[PDB]
Design a protein around this ligand. Sequence first.
Ligand SMILES: [Zn+2]
Lengths: 49, 144, 86, 82, 82, 86
Amino acid sequence: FINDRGIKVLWEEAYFCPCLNPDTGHPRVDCPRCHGKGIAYLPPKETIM
Amino acid sequence: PIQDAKPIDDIVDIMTYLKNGKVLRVKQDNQGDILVRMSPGKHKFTEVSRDLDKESFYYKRHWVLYNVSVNSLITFDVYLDEEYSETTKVKYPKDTIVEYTREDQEKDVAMIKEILTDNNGNYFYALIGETMLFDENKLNKVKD
Amino acid sequence: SIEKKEEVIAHNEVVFRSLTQGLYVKEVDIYSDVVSYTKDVDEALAMPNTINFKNSRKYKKLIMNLDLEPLNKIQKVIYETHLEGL
Amino acid sequence: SIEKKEEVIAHNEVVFRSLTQGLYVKEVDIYSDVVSYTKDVDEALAMPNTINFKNSRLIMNLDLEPLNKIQKVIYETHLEGL
Amino acid sequence: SIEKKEEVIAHNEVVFRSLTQGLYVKEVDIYSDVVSYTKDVDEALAMPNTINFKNSRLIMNLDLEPLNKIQKVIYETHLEGL
Amino acid sequence: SIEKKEEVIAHNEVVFRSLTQGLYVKEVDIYSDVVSYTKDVDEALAMPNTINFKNSRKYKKLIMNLDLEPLNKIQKVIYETHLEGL
Ligand SMILES: [Zn+2]
């Protein structure tokens, strides 16, 4: 049922980047893992949803 | 000849090198190049990196898990990361659609079979079905 | 008689030198080509190289220039405790 | 290699230590006789290491093992090539 | 064509330039010896171009290629027909 | 010895002239017929002609009058840098 009514979608999990400032607790403006957002992401997983 | 490429043929050799732990470089189509690696320690699993440059005090590679498909390895070209050459400065890449003229002044299409050069830097090209060498000007890059 | 020893890193940043001219870069243009120079290490186009700032993007064109020699400028402070008897 | 270096002596003191237990002195009484001991090397009771003080008051106990403590702090830089 | 025009000289200065590297001077030391160079033509170190200054201090280095820099700024109008 | 040159446009506006009278318009009535005149370019019924203000509507009746000669009054400032040697 789910595979039938769903749409193909890329699922990528979220995790806090190591680049977070240890003292303020807020992220670097630019880094490869996360582009200013304080949360990085894992490789995508193909999924129907 | 030129030493800028040494592709691996058998997937068995690829797996053997992965067991040894040496990094690999895996090309893609209209997409960024990939590095692949086997994780160390107790648990063995494949890891990948989107970065390509050599490790240094100012540059470190990032590794993450991924369910790499054997289809990619068997199909796509693979090299040893340490011994890979970034570019060979030639107009036409290897395995590229090209056009030429035969000995009887007949036009024909082909793909590049070999890329060669002399000691003075002049580049000669050999096409499929043509044993003789062709000048860079004599070839024509066919549009997709 | 070093009773105890400790080390600290104050700064760790990259600095570039021209191979032939022997000068250190200080400024670049919009295209990121060198505009100015100095013969002073204390005044240079420092690129941070701490743990967080690795794998930068601001100076990719500068790095690939063969005329430039990157240098890892690192500053340290080391504390040594001596016990010299009576 | 080294591009620039300088050495300075932040402190120079005399530390008192017991001969039997091996622990340094931490706290003392009115006459400066020992009431507490500590295993730390830095927190131990200490006095300036100059002749004037020594002439200005060893004096507390017969456990006669003072220890001249000297602290060296060094500033340096490197230019490590690629 | 031109209906009205006027020319004025906003600045008139002397620029210093190296003979070998070809880069102009940007920053200098206490004695005004060179410590920095720049490729820019306008940002380069410069001094007023008048005889009094010249007599009041070429003096810094043997790279004897100063450059008289003169800036012309012109105001004009046109009445272009149809 | 022009080391470098640059140009700037300060104003760009339209001004109208009577073919026979030689005067410049300054004022119009509700019907947009000419009411007044001047022999001074600095005081005229200027129509803006910058990039944004093209294809106006305020002066359509005025434009079609054959007795009037539109003129593109443009004001410029040009900076020239001279290097005259020693
Ligand atoms: Zn991050």
